[PDB]
Amino acid sequence: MSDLFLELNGKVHSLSETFPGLSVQEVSRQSPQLSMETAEIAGTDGVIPGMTQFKPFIFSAKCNLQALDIPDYHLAVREIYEFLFQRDSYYIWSDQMPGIRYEVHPKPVDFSRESDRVGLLTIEFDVFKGYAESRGTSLDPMTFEVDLWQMGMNLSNRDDLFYVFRENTFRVYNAGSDRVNPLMRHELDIAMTANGTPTIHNLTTGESFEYRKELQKTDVLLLNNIYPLVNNRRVGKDTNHGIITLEKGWNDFEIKGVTDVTIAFNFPFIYR
Amino acid sequence: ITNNDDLLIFAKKQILDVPETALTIAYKGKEPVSERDVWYFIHEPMGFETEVKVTKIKSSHPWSKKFQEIGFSNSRRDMVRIQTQIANQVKKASVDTNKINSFSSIAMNAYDSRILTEVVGVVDGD
C-alpha cells in the first residue's frame, strides 16, 4: 500500500486518511537536474565547466478519487483543491521512503473525469531547494523508538554516530550527499559552552571560527547559519567572521583556547 | 616661462605623435589578475607579442562564472567621460570669470587712489 504524508502548519496529514475516496496509486521522483555552468571559448573544442549546480525538480504522485455520487465527487474535488494548494511551501514524504522529506510547492493539475464518480489525478510538487533532506536533524537520537531513520540514508554501519562532544578534539560525520554550507542557505546550528576564549577549527575543510572575548560556562555560544550569538545577542563584531562547513563523511574538529568544552551540532542531512 | 628650452620641452609635451590605441581582453583563466602585474600578451592572428600593463579591470565574483574584462593603454572613448571633461572645463571657466570680475573691480578700485594722488599733486603744483 502507498500513501503520501503532508506536513502543514506543524500537523502531519495522510492524503488517504484525510480524503477517504482518494487513494495514492504510485509515487515517483524526477532525477536531480545537474547543470554545469559552461563557458565557451570560440575556436576551441567543448566547454570549460564551472561549478556543478542542481536545479529544482518534480515529485509526482499518481492517484485516483472514487466518490459515492456526483455531488460528492464535486465536493471532494473542491476540498482536495483547497487542501493541496496553500499560500506557502510545505513538506511531503511517502510510505516507500518514510525517512526522507521534501519541501515543496504544488503545481496546477487537472482532474481527469473518467466516469460519473471516478477521477484520475497526477499531483506534481515542485521541490525548489534542489535536494531532499532527512525528516529528523542530527540532534535526534539514532534509536528505534524515535521512528525516524530508515535504510538508505547513508548511515555508517561501522561506528557510532553522536553529535555532542565533551573534548577539544573529535570527529563529526555528515551523512548527506552535499557539503553543509550555511552560505548555500543550509541549516546548521552549533551550540558550545566552555570557559575561556574559544577557537573552532575544521581541519578536513580547513576552516576556523574565532571569538575574541572571554567566555564562561554559563554563557552559550550559538552559531545559527551565518549568525554567531551569545545568549541570543549578536556579537559578529567580536569574531573573525569565519564560518565552518561540514564536508561529506568525517570531519576532524579541534577546539582551542577553552576548557571543559561542551559542543553540540544540530543540522539536517542533505540528500539527492 | 622665458627661456627656449622650457618652451621646447613644453611643446614636446603638448602634442601626441603616435596613434592613440586602447586594448581590451576578455580573460577566462584560473590565475587571478591583480592591479599591478604586467602580463605577456601573445596573439598571432592580431600580430601581438609584447608585455601588457593592466590599467583597467572589470572582475566578477569568484562564484559568478562570468568572464573578466581587462584593459591596457588607456580606455575607450565613451560619452560620459566627455561630459565630465566638459563639466570640469565649465567649472574652471566659471571660477576664472568669478575671479576676474573681482580683479576688474579692484582695477577700478586701484584707480581712485591714483586719481587722488594726481589731484593732490596738481594742487601742490599750483
UniProtKB/TrEMBL annotation, chain A:
<dbReference type="InterPro" id="IPR008841">
    <property type="entry name" value="Siphovirus-type_tail_N"/>
</dbReference>
<protein>
    <submittedName>
        <fullName>FtbK</fullName>
    </submittedName>
</protein>
<dbReference type="Pfam" id="PF05709">
    <property type="entry name" value="Sipho_tail"/>
</dbReference>
<feature type="domain" description="Siphovirus-type tail component RIFT-related">
    <location>
        <begin position="9"/>
        <end position="127"/>
    </location>
</feature>
UniProtKB/TrEMBL annotation, chain B:
<protein>
    <submittedName>
        <fullName>FtbL</fullName>
    </submittedName>
</protein>
